[PDB]
Amino acid sequence: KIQVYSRHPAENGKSNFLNCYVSGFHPSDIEVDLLKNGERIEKVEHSDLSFSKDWSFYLLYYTEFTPTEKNEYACRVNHVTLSQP
Amino acid sequence: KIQVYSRHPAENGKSNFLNCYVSGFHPSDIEVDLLKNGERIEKVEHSDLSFSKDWSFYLLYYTEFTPTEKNEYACRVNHVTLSQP
Amino acid sequence: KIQVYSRHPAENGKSNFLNCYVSGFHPSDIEVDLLKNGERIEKVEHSDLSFSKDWSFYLLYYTEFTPTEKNEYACRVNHVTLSQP
Amino acid sequence: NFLNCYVSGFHPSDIEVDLLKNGERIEKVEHSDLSFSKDWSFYLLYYTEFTPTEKNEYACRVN
Amino acid sequence: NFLNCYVSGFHPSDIEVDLLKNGERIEKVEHSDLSFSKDWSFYLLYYTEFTPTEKNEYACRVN
Amino acid sequence: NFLNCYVSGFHPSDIEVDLLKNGERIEKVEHSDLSFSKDWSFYLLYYTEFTPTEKNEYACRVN
């Protein structure tokens, strides 16, 4: 019963990693405006500019929150497993 | 019972990784406006510009949230497994 | 019962890692404005500019929050496991 | 008497790359990519048996 | 009497890379990329048996 | 009598990289990237048997 794992690669050249895992709320490049350029305007009343009310990554009610997770968030993962019972 | 894993690649040249995993709420390049350029406007009343109300990645009610996940979020994954019972 | 793990790679070239794991609330490049440039405006009344009310990463009510997680957040993970019962 | 006996390699000239040279009243400029090049490598070899034999005489005369 | 007996390598000239040279009333400039190059490597070898044999005579005369 | 008997290596000239040279009334400038280069390596070798044999005569005369 002989198991042999041999790994000798030759990686020639630089390696670049960027934004390997992006999640959640992340909008970008958004513009909300009213009367950006206005002249000879008599009255401006009851203006309501709203982007959001409440930010809650977890919002639970009477919840049995029971996750069992084994995750690997990375850029370069090397998950090697040998088993010889 | 002999199992041999040999891996010696020659990777010639640079490697580039970008935005390997993107999820969730991420809209971009959005414009909401009213009267961008206006003149000789007497009254502007009851303006309502709304983008969103509530941001909640998890919103549960009387929920039995029980996931069992084994995930691998990455850019380059090397998942090698040898088994010799 | 002989199990041998041999790993002698030759990584030639620099390695760069940036933003390996980004999550949560992180919007960027957002502009909310009213009357950016205005002239000869008599009255400006009842202006309401709101971005958000409450920031709460965890907001629970009568919740049995019981997660069992074994996660690995990194840029370069080397998870090697040998088992020989 | 401009003379070039031997000119080689990367030598570009008289190049103009421009974006919005003379512009006015521009609202947004997002994600502009103005890159001339990435990597400069004269001898880039991989597992190469580089065995050149040369006997060159660079003799350009001017009178 | 401009004379070049042997010119090699990376030598670009007369290059102008510009973005919004003469601009007015600009609101946003986001994520501009103006990079001339990344890496400068004259001899970049990997497992290379570099064995050049050269007997060159660079003799450019001016009278 | 400008004479170059042997010129090599990285020698660029007359390069102008500019962003918003003459600008007015600009609100935001975010994440600008103006990098000429990263690494300067003349001899960058990996496991290389570097064995050059050269007998060169650089003899450029001026009278």
Residue numbers in the entry:
A (entry chain C), B (entry chain A), C (entry chain E): 6 to 90
D (entry chain B), E (entry chain D), F (entry chain F): 21 to 83
Study authors write:
β2-microglobulin (β2m) and its truncated variant ΔΝ6 are co-deposited in amyloid fibrils in the joints, causing the disorder dialysis-related amyloidosis (DRA). We show that the aggregation of each variant in vitro results in fibrils that are polymorphic, which contain different numbers of protofilaments and different numbers of β2m subunits per layer of the amyloid fibril structure. High resolution structures, however, show that this polymorphism arises from the assembly of a common building block that is strikingly homogeneous and monomorphic.
Amyloid formation of the variant β2m sequence, β2m-D76N, which bears a single Asp to Asn substitution in a solvent exposed loop of the native monomer was next investigated. Subsequent 3D classifications revealed that a mixture of 1PF and 2PF forms were present, which allowed us to refine the structures of three distinct fibril polymorphs: two different 1PF filaments and a single 2PF form. The cryoEM density for D76N-2PFa, however, was of sufficient quality to allow an unambiguous atomic model to be built, although the amount of resolved protein sequence per layer is lower than for the equivalent structures of fibrils of β2m-ΔN6 (i.e. ΔN6-2PFa). Strikingly, protofilament #1 has a similar structure to protofilament #1 in ΔΝ6-2PFa with residues 6 to 90 resolved. The length of ordered polypeptide chain resolved in protofilament #2 is shorter, with only residues 21–83 being sufficiently ordered to build a model. Despite this difference, the same hammer shaped motif is apparent. The ΔN6-2PFa and D76N-2PFa structures have a very similar structure. In each, protofilament #1 adopts a “termini up” conformation, whilst protofilament #2 adopts a “termini down” orientation. Notably, this marked difference in dynamics of the termini of β2m-D76N fibrils occurs despite the absence of any obvious perturbation of the amyloid core structure caused by the substitution of Asp76 for Asn, since residue 76 is located within a polar cavity that accommodates either side chain without generating steric hindrances or electrostatic repulsion. Interestingly, the ∆Go analysis suggests that E74 and D76 are still destabilising in this conformation, although this does not include potential stabilisation by water molecules that are not resolved in the structure. This analysis does however predict that the D76N substitution would completely negate the destabilising effect of this residue in the amyloid fold, which may explain why D76N fibrils form faster than the other variants.
